Design a protein around this ligand. Sequence first.
Ligand SMILES: Cc1ccc(NS(=O)(=O)c2ccccc2)c(C(=O)O)c1
Ligand SMILES: [Mn+2]
Ligand SMILES: [Mn+2]
Length: 369
Amino acid sequence: KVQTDPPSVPICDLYPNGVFPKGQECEYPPTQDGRTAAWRTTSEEKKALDQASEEIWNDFREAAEAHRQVRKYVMSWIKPGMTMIEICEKLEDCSRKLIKENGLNAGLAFPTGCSLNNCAAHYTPNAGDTTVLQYDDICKIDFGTHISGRIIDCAFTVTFNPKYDTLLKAVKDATNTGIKCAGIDVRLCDVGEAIQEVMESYEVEIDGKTYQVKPIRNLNGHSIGQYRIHAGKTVPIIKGGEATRMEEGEVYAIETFGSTGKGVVHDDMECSHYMKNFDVGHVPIRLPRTKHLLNVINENFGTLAFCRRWLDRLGESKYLMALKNLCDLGIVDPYPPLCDIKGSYTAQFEHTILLRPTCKEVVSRGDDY
Ligand SMILES: Cc1ccc(NS(=O)(=O)c2ccccc2)c(C(=O)O)c1
Ligand SMILES: [Mn+2]
Ligand SMILES: [Mn+2]
């Protein structure tokens, strides 16, 4: 009863029983008294709690399998010479098909980030962007999928010149350290301190200059909520930050960013990412164009992030002022590209993890990273 598998068959159609593959399952890290998590691994009480939200975990897994298959595909063809628009459209086209896009029930969780070099996040081309990926570019591919609002935020870094190899290794190791440190009752600040320690243990040499990799201090991981990419809690990336503990049942985006610059990002370049304020309720709007755009946003994205290209594909035109109005009203928030100093290089690696009652599941883990 098999069939096609190349990037064209929806993940849902690949599993008739509706049960999707689990990600990497890890035992929760010990504590002071060396209290391991071997007991919680099968605990009858926890096993029940976990099984109670099996439908939720399952949805994350379906979205994760889509993410794994989409990215494996992307890595096979992304090459310098392609425009950033060509890259994002080809990736998104596949993502939409594998996730079996269905309105707000299944689809793309957020725009395809493809931030270059000193820019670390939130850059995706808008219409007319002629930017071309270069051999020496360090591109952060950050895209998301979701099933019923259960979001998979996962990212990796693309390079073609081996000179960035140790920088990527540093960030990948830092992210895996954060993933290993994460757990129920674990203080967020400890995760950040652990991440910084690993990150900074790496020194790299690029074009004759040496650098001690720096975590981007004002960037971080975050808890994830249904249809809410950033539920409220933040996972630092450096020491001294977040005096809160991770809790059972929570879901986190564990990401780290390393940089050869100041280790700080600032808003720069034209904005492409936007997202309705999760807390803003219904707001009556009479302005025709603004009213229509808000309706389009509510129908197609809800509280999920979107980009200008996604408005263009829906047939919307000359909507910039309306979009600005929504932002000025506080109904929608702009999320411009976040970049370090000109000339610097930034790298990123990210995974979504489920803090399940019985274990810690790195649901987006793959054979690649
Ligand atoms: C639109 C949007 C809103 C919030 C987000 N989460 S975040 O603020 O913790 C964040 C994380 C990493 C880079 C930049 C921002 C993200 C995201 O995880 O990138 C995207
Ligand atoms: Mn991300
Ligand atoms: Mn994230």
